[PDB]
Write an enzyme that holds these catalytic residues in place. Sequence first.
Site, PDB file in Angstrom:
ATOM      1  N   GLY A 270       0.291  10.951 -54.162  1.00  0.00           N
ATOM      2  CA  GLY A 270       1.036   9.732 -53.871  1.00  0.00           C
ATOM      3  C   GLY A 270       0.279   8.943 -52.816  1.00  0.00           C
ATOM      4  O   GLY A 270      -0.709   9.430 -52.241  1.00  0.00           O
ATOM      5  N   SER A 271       0.729   7.715 -52.572  1.00  0.00           N
ATOM      6  CA  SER A 271       0.209   6.918 -51.447  1.00  0.00           C
ATOM      7  C   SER A 271       1.250   5.980 -50.748  1.00  0.00           C
ATOM      8  O   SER A 271       2.459   6.284 -50.671  1.00  0.00           O
ATOM      9  CB  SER A 271      -1.057   6.141 -51.868  1.00  0.00           C
ATOM     10  OG  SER A 271      -0.892   5.476 -53.111  1.00  0.00           O
ATOM     11  N   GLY A 272       0.737   4.863 -50.220  1.00  0.00           N
ATOM     12  CA  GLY A 272       1.536   3.822 -49.595  1.00  0.00           C
ATOM     13  C   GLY A 272       0.854   3.346 -48.327  1.00  0.00           C
ATOM     14  O   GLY A 272      -0.386   3.525 -48.138  1.00  0.00           O
TER      15      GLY A 272
ATOM     16  N   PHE B 222       1.786   4.422 -45.237  1.00  0.00           N
ATOM     17  CA  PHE B 222       1.538   5.690 -44.469  1.00  0.00           C
ATOM     18  C   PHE B 222       0.134   6.313 -44.787  1.00  0.00           C
ATOM     19  O   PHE B 222      -0.502   6.927 -43.895  1.00  0.00           O
ATOM     20  CB  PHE B 222       2.669   6.742 -44.696  1.00  0.00           C
ATOM     21  CG  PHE B 222       2.423   7.667 -45.891  1.00  0.00           C
ATOM     22  CD1 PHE B 222       1.525   8.748 -45.799  1.00  0.00           C
ATOM     23  CD2 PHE B 222       3.066   7.443 -47.115  1.00  0.00           C
ATOM     24  CE1 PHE B 222       1.259   9.580 -46.909  1.00  0.00           C
ATOM     25  CE2 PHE B 222       2.808   8.288 -48.234  1.00  0.00           C
ATOM     26  CZ  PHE B 222       1.898   9.352 -48.121  1.00  0.00           C
TER      27      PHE B 222
ATOM     28  N   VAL C 190      -2.020  11.073 -50.404  1.00  0.00           N
ATOM     29  CA  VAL C 190      -2.002  12.538 -50.358  1.00  0.00           C
ATOM     30  C   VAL C 190      -2.661  13.139 -51.619  1.00  0.00           C
ATOM     31  O   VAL C 190      -2.267  12.784 -52.714  1.00  0.00           O
ATOM     32  CB  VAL C 190      -0.524  13.094 -50.191  1.00  0.00           C
ATOM     33  CG1 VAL C 190      -0.494  14.595 -49.987  1.00  0.00           C
ATOM     34  CG2 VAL C 190       0.179  12.457 -49.034  1.00  0.00           C
TER      35      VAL C 190
ATOM     36  N   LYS D 153      -3.792  15.045 -46.590  1.00  0.00           N
ATOM     37  CA  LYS D 153      -3.099  13.817 -46.226  1.00  0.00           C
ATOM     38  C   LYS D 153      -3.982  13.037 -45.283  1.00  0.00           C
ATOM     39  O   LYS D 153      -4.391  13.539 -44.235  1.00  0.00           O
ATOM     40  CB  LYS D 153      -1.725  14.128 -45.618  1.00  0.00           C
ATOM     41  CG  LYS D 153      -0.930  12.906 -45.172  1.00  0.00           C
ATOM     42  CD  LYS D 153       0.514  13.300 -44.833  1.00  0.00           C
ATOM     43  CE  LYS D 153       1.382  12.143 -44.339  1.00  0.00           C
ATOM     44  NZ  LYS D 153       2.852  12.605 -44.175  1.00  0.00           N
TER      45      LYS D 153
ATOM     46  N   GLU E  35       0.627  22.979 -46.539  1.00  0.00           N
ATOM     47  CA  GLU E  35       0.847  23.819 -47.726  1.00  0.00           C
ATOM     48  C   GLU E  35       1.339  23.037 -48.907  1.00  0.00           C
ATOM     49  O   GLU E  35       1.755  21.889 -48.753  1.00  0.00           O
ATOM     50  CB  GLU E  35       1.711  25.045 -47.454  1.00  0.00           C
ATOM     51  CG  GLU E  35       3.125  24.794 -47.127  1.00  0.00           C
ATOM     52  CD  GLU E  35       3.735  25.971 -46.392  1.00  0.00           C
ATOM     53  OE1 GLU E  35       4.965  25.987 -46.151  1.00  0.00           O
ATOM     54  OE2 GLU E  35       2.969  26.892 -46.050  1.00  0.00           O
TER      55      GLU E  35
ATOM     56  N   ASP F 225       9.675  16.507 -56.053  1.00  0.00           N
ATOM     57  CA  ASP F 225      10.368  15.995 -54.902  1.00  0.00           C
ATOM     58  C   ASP F 225      11.816  15.647 -55.245  1.00  0.00           C
ATOM     59  O   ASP F 225      12.130  15.399 -56.412  1.00  0.00           O
ATOM     60  CB  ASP F 225       9.533  14.910 -54.214  1.00  0.00           C
ATOM     61  CG  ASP F 225       9.738  13.492 -54.773  1.00  0.00           C
ATOM     62  OD1 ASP F 225      10.607  13.197 -55.658  1.00  0.00           O
ATOM     63  OD2 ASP F 225       9.000  12.625 -54.235  1.00  0.00           O
TER      64      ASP F 225
ATOM     65  N   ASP G 214      13.603  10.619 -40.670  1.00  0.00           N
ATOM     66  CA  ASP G 214      13.477  10.035 -41.993  1.00  0.00           C
ATOM     67  C   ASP G 214      13.889  10.992 -43.142  1.00  0.00           C
ATOM     68  O   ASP G 214      13.197  11.125 -44.150  1.00  0.00           O
ATOM     69  CB  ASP G 214      12.067   9.482 -42.172  1.00  0.00           C
ATOM     70  CG  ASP G 214      11.958   8.528 -43.339  1.00  0.00           C
ATOM     71  OD1 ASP G 214      13.007   7.894 -43.678  1.00  0.00           O
ATOM     72  OD2 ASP G 214      10.835   8.461 -43.928  1.00  0.00           O
TER      73      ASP G 214
END
EC number: 2.7.11.1
Length: 274
Positions: A13-15, A17, A20, A35, A89, A96, A135
């Site tokens: 995933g990304s964004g 932040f 990963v 990450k 890990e 998710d 969060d």
Amino acid sequence: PLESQYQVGPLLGSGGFGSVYSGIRVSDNLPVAIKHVEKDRISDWGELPNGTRVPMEVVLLKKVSSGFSGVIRLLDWFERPDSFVLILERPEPVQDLFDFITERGALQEELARSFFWQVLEAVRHCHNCGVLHRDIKDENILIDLNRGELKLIDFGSGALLKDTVYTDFDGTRVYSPPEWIRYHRYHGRSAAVWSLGILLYDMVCGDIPFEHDEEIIRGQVFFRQRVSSECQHLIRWCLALRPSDRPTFEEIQNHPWMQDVLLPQETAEIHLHS
Ligand SMILES: CN(C)Cc1nc2c(sc3ccc(/C=C/C4CC4)cc32)c(=O)[nH]1
């Protein structure tokens, strides 16, 4: 040292932040997650027992890493000229809580309770370690589909826990409490309990209760699916408008709806088709 010990797989995933990637420690084949966080996008820095200048996320990760598998552990990290690289890990297979809810809709109460408990046990662990996640939500919760164990992830808006007031929030709006929305102040615990109330409504209704600021300030909870009276009681308790009207973790975990929880193994057997 160096970028020898790990083997970079697909992006997960990304964004804003970061990004990963799936990864394999060569040193012994263990699954990991890689990450990458950009210096420019870190507003909150911290410093180690060791006393160096690292992202807050890394401080909090170190304070929460150890025996208990309810939080994702940080195995190692690196520094680069424009980023930090974190090795954490990775359970196989994993999905998710957001996707798992996108697929299966509202969860059966029994499944929600086992999930909710486990989140409760994760967040209690963070609170002991002097960490506040800030969060909590479906996307920051990984399910290890084989053992039926939830793992809380992503400390990138977390802070050191403290008893005074917080006047900053860089987490998810729709999960934030109404004291934040109006006054720009909250306290850790009570704001965490609100996010848990939201999270539990999510789990059991297939979706989150409030979309807009006014629905948050109003704090009135409409139920769109069949949900037992006791679950409804707990959700509304967590979503009390006055922070001090909210339950403590202990009060949540002694709530009648929280009784006779399944074990993680039993949970996968019955609900994750282990
Ligand atoms: C939660 N988001 C914003 C990104 C994020 N992902 C992870 C972490 S540790 C971590 C460990 C494993 C996996 C594998 C996930 C599967 C569903 C796609 C992801 C992550 C984080 O710290 N941040």
